[PDB]
UniProtKB/Swiss-Prot annotation:
Residues where Phosphotyrosine is found: 306
Gene (name only): MAPK14
Function in brief: Serine/threonine kinase which acts as an essential component of the MAP kinase signal transduction pathway. MAPK14 is one of the four p38 MAPKs which play an important role in the cascades of cellular responses evoked by extracellular stimuli such as pro-inflammatory cytokines or physical stress leading to direct activation of transcription factors. Accordingly, p38 MAPKs phosphorylate a broad range of proteins and it has been estimated that they may have approximately 200 to 300 substrates each. (Microbial infection) Activated by phosphorylation by M.tuberculosis EsxA in T-cells leading to inhibition of IFN-gamma production; phosphorylation is apparent within 15 minutes and is inhibited by kinase-specific inhibitors SB203580 and siRNA.
Outcome recorded upon mutating residue 303 to T: Lowered kinase activity
Protein name: Mitogen-activated protein kinase 14
Catalytic reaction annotation: L-seryl-[protein] + ATP = O-phospho-L-seryl-[protein] + ADP + H(+); L-threonyl-[protein] + ATP = O-phospho-L-threonyl-[protein] + ADP + H(+)
Entries under InterPro entries matching the protein: Kinase-like_dom_sf, MAP_kinase, MAP_kinase_CS, MAPK14, MAPK_p38-like, Prot_kinase_dom, Protein_kinase_ATP_BS
Residues that bear N6-acetyllysine: 46, 145
Cofactor annotation: Mg(2+)
Outcome of substituting residue 161 to A: Loss of kinase activity
Annotated Pfam families: Pkinase
Sequence similarity: Belongs to the protein kinase superfamily. CMGC Ser/Thr protein kinase family. MAP kinase subfamily.
Free-text comment on this protein's domains from its UniProt entry: The TXY motif contains the threonine and tyrosine residues whose phosphorylation activates the MAP kinases.
Amino acid sequence: ERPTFYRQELNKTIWEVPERYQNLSPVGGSVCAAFDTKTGLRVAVKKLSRPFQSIIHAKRTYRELRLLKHMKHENVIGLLDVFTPARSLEEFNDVYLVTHLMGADLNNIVKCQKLTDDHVQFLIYQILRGLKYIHSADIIHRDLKPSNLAVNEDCELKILDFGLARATRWYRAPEIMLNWMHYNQTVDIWSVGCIMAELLTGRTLFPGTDHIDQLKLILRLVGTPGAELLKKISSESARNYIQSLTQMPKMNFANVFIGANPLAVDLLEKMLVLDSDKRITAAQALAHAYFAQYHDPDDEPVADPYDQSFESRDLLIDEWKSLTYDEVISFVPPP
Ligand SMILES: CONC(=O)c1ccc(C)c(Nc2ncnn3cc(C(=O)N[C@@H](C)c4ccccc4)c(C)c23)c1
Ligand SMILES: CONC(=O)c1ccc(C)c(Nc2ncnn3cc(C(=O)N[C@@H](C)c4ccccc4)c(C)c23)c1
């Protein structure tokens, strides 16, 4: 039951989509907002860029589709449709992904108002709830930032672009930015702390100009690593570099986030720590007293087992293309 497709050029690529999707308008692969005539809702349509023109692209294409088909959670963007104008595998060269269109991203929100404490609580609670789910599937975001957190008029939130990375500087955990010690899923928690601070104050917590300046701003708040944490620094170059910097004492966060809910400050103290072994997890964060009004252990679900064995495979473009085609054809839209 192939739908009828129509073709158009939108500065300056070809978009070939089902007539179902009307009034495409660029918003960003490349992304367009559109009207889904079947449902009456606005959607975001992403055309993957050159999905099968290289092995890296082919594998990324498969990776993204597999992730989107598996993750089903209220705070994680969901796949509404996936299509190709191709009539067969032999003709398969383009892939389009469709999701709900949201109202605004967190960058837009902070630029336009001032958020009350309850508003912050609910947003952060939702981000952590989505992260608990994603992390439970052994997936991490790795590049969580205000631009990939989308909300709709009722403050209902969705996480986008997770599990793809394998401004960012402002929200990046130092252990990955500086490759200075082992890391775990809490790299995403550092990002949440930076985001939460920004929602609370209205300003970027650590707006560094480059990686060196970024570290400088971070250490001004958290304090230079000393003997204790230095014991865990595996990189000799990193140890040498750290010891070359002007030593800074840790700041009491309460003197920084003046006027903030003391519980918000306590939570930030637990997220913004350099030691990856000590940083709070998503699940632990949800249980923090700051979220007492929202927390419900019976409504913070985990993900069904996720098979990502494909990550360890080295296949040809046509092989990844065939696997992707299989997933496109087998797709069943959300009820
Ligand atoms: C696992 O990674 N794959 C993904 O997450 C993944 C995969 C496919 C897709 C189609 C998406 N969705 C989006 N991708 C890129 N930009 N974009 C922006 C919005 C949006 O709603 N903007 C609002 C504020 C807006 C509202 C009005 C106008 C303009 C913008 C959405 C929903 C997206 C994510
Ligand atoms: C990846 O491709 N490059 C390669 O070939 C390759 C291969 C092996 C290694 C060990 C690396 N090194 C890095 N890889 C990824 N991130 N990273 C971040 C930093 C950094 O900021 N160091 C700080 C402490 C610093 C700052 C100033 C001076 C000294 C150290 C470094 C040195 C890296 C790269």
